[PDB]
């Protein structure tokens, strides 16, 4: 009990430097690098916390090799990237990892009744920024989420001449 106002603004070094410090108990290889100056997104430190966490626990558990949790930023549009390694995405897999969107007259649907915990998904997608995924050689998996941010005012240096 104490109010509850979810997405809104918020730092995304400020939101995994709290998944970090939580992640970080007991060999989690977790290597931080975010981007060094202040980020600002309007977000919610809920649903993205849960988002940073759930996908360490992939390379926590079967993997212990090394993970990575950096986060970087741009001019009207800021995002983070994660990096663990191991066996990578598989070859038929790629094409089927929880892909938003289809293309049909027909499902087929034979069975599979229960809940839809989709986590993550729902958190870039009620942001409305972006979410890909990569892997170098299946062997080095990074992930790119990214999260715009509202309307601001930065121009830079410019001379007329
Ligand atoms: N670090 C990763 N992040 C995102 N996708 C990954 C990662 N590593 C592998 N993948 C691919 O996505 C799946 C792993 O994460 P995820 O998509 O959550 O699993 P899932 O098979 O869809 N559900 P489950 O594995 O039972 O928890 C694998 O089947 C890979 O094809």
Redesign the pocket.
């Given at each position: 009990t104490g109010q509850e106002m979810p997405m809104e603004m918020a730092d995304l070094n400020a939101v995994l430097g709290e998944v970090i410090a939580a992640e970080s108990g007991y060999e989690r290889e977790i290597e931080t690098a975010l981007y060094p100056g202040s980020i600002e997104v309007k977000m919610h430190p809920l649903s993205i916390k849960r988002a940073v966490a759930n996908?360490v626990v992939?390379?926590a558990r079967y993997g212990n090799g090394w993970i990575k949790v950096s986060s970087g930023t741009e001019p009207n549009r800021a995002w983070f990237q994660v990096e663990?390694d191991?066996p990578?995405?598989?070859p038929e897999?790629?094409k089927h990892?929880?892909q938003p969107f289809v293309r049909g007259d027909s499902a087929r649907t034979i069975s599979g009744t229960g809940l839809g915990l989709a986590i993550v998904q729902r958190i870039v997608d009620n942001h409305n920024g972006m979410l890909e995924?990569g892997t170098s050689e299946r062997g080095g998996?990074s992930?790119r989420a990214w999260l715009p941010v509202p309307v601001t005012r930065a121009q830079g240096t410019t001379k007329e001449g």
């Open positions: 996908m992939n390379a663990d191991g990578g995405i598989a897999q790629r990892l929880f995924l998996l992930i």
